[PDB]
Amino acid sequence: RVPARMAATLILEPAGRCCWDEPVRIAVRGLAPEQPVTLRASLRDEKGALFQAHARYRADTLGELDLERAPALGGSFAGLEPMGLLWALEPEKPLVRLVKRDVRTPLAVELEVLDGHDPDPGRLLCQTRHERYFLPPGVRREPVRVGRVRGTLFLPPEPGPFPGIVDMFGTGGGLLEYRASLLAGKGFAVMALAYYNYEDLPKTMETLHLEYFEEAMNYLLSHPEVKGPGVGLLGISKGGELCLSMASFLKGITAAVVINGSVANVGGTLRYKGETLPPVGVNRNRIKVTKDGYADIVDVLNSPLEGPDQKSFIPVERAESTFLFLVGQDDHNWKSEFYANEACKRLQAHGRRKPQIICYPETGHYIEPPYFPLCRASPIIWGGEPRAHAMAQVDAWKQLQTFFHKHL
Structure with missing residues (x-):
């Protein structure tokens, strides 16, 4: 019996240095065919304040989830919205404005792929850190x-x-x-x-x-x-x-x-x-x-x-x-x-x-x-x-x- 498949992997384009004002294309490979998943984006500002968004998706028949090809099914947003995980970010604490003042350091967006569509997230299938620069x-x-x-x-x-x-x-x-x-x-x-x-x-x-x-x-x-x-x-x-x-x-x-x-x-x-x-x-x-x-x-x-x-x-x-x-x-x-x-x-x-x-x-x-x-x-x-x-x-x-x- 051959070993189990390797873990899922997130792929971004561009893979390297992305400015805050630039679009990124997010894909996941190595999921099960038609696997229901939840993607969650998390950001902490310079004041330590949490901003988050999430959306439900389903991988295609190849176990691929590409956000310029697959629509969000619900969550913080719905539809073919490649950048929704960023534009739909909401503060954990109501009334909090995002604080970003030092342009010399990036804001990191943590991207998680979680198993299932349950309101309480399943297991973490993969993650990546996406840094976004201001200079x-x-x-x-x-x-x-x-x-x-x-x-x-x-x-x-x-x-x-x-x-x-x-x-x-x-x-x-x-x-x-x-x-x-x-x-x-x-x-x-x-x-x-x-x-x-x-x-x-x-x-x-x-x-x-x-x-x-x-x-x-x-x-x-x-x-x-x-x-x-x-x-x-x-x-x-x-x-x-x-x-x-x-x-x-x-x-x-x-x-x-x-x-x-x-x-x-x-x-x-x-x-x-x-x-x-x-x-x-x-x-x-x-x-x-x-x-x-x-x-x-x-x-x-x-x-x-x-x-x-x-x-x-x-x-x-x-x-x-x-x-x-x-x-x-x-x-x-x-x-x-x-x-x-x-x-x-x-x-x-x-x-x-x-x-x-x-x-x-x-x-x-x-x-x-x-x-x-x-x-x-x-x-x-x-x-x-x-x-x-x-x-x-x-x-x-x-x-x-x-x-x-x-x-x-």
Whole structure:
């Protein structure tokens, strides 16, 4: 009698170094013909927090399970969804946002193949560790500490020069580098820019001075490996708001991608030389408690279209820049589509080019780079449905690349 068959084996393409924003093809060989199995993906973030997804499958008649050929039958998702084990990842503890800050180390996804379709998993038939990197091949990380400017520059491998982008996130303070590092992998010099509560910067954003942002952009533009003659701006939330403010008041901005930004100045006072924008007013009575114990704050901010709140409207008509607005239709942080439309109306009322707006159905506030799992709530809701939001993230990433390549 011949020995028993060797154990099942997982095969990935690509087998080696995969960036976070890149698709992978997962296959298992050496299962029994038509064997029912459960695949489980597990990830621990830099804070030790667990994220998991699982789906049921059935091997084919050869005992092969290939996720670009076999559909998920149920679990965290169903259908021919090769990347579902990643986009459907859910935190073990509700309310937990994924924490990834050091772009120099990968996030590991542990993949398990477990026997059977029982809700309580069978025996482990095979496993593999799939590392996903945030610093693309040959991308150079260069911290920025020039004048008062604080951020981190990412450059592609030599030779330059490269189109330059300033990258900005919203409120929370500190510096998120992961989008800039990934985007530098597409041929751009990208500066992740901090503006409060990081290193020696002012601890709060009670008042923000656009002069700081002018300095940052001038530094990027003056870099020996940045192409010019202007820069791109990429911002989400308050960061997109700042893209509009920068483009309205400052020179040297060629194009801006605004992701769920606001045309109202919110949360503090903006100053540039003799000019000021007061914060738009709030109405905490407009809060909705639904349909769990979560706040819905989408209606709290006053309209920048009536009363003294018109003062907080960013004068986008003064911008020379081209704009692309990427909005989640289900944004519950604030009225992103309304802001995009009102920016467009302001611009057209002054004979400026009409900006492209892309509105993604069932997508929420946090449109992150691809395969970042949806955070539904963290407490307030942010909006989005897992699959719709995931595919919006994948598409937005291609849209901004195309746009920046065209204009920069």
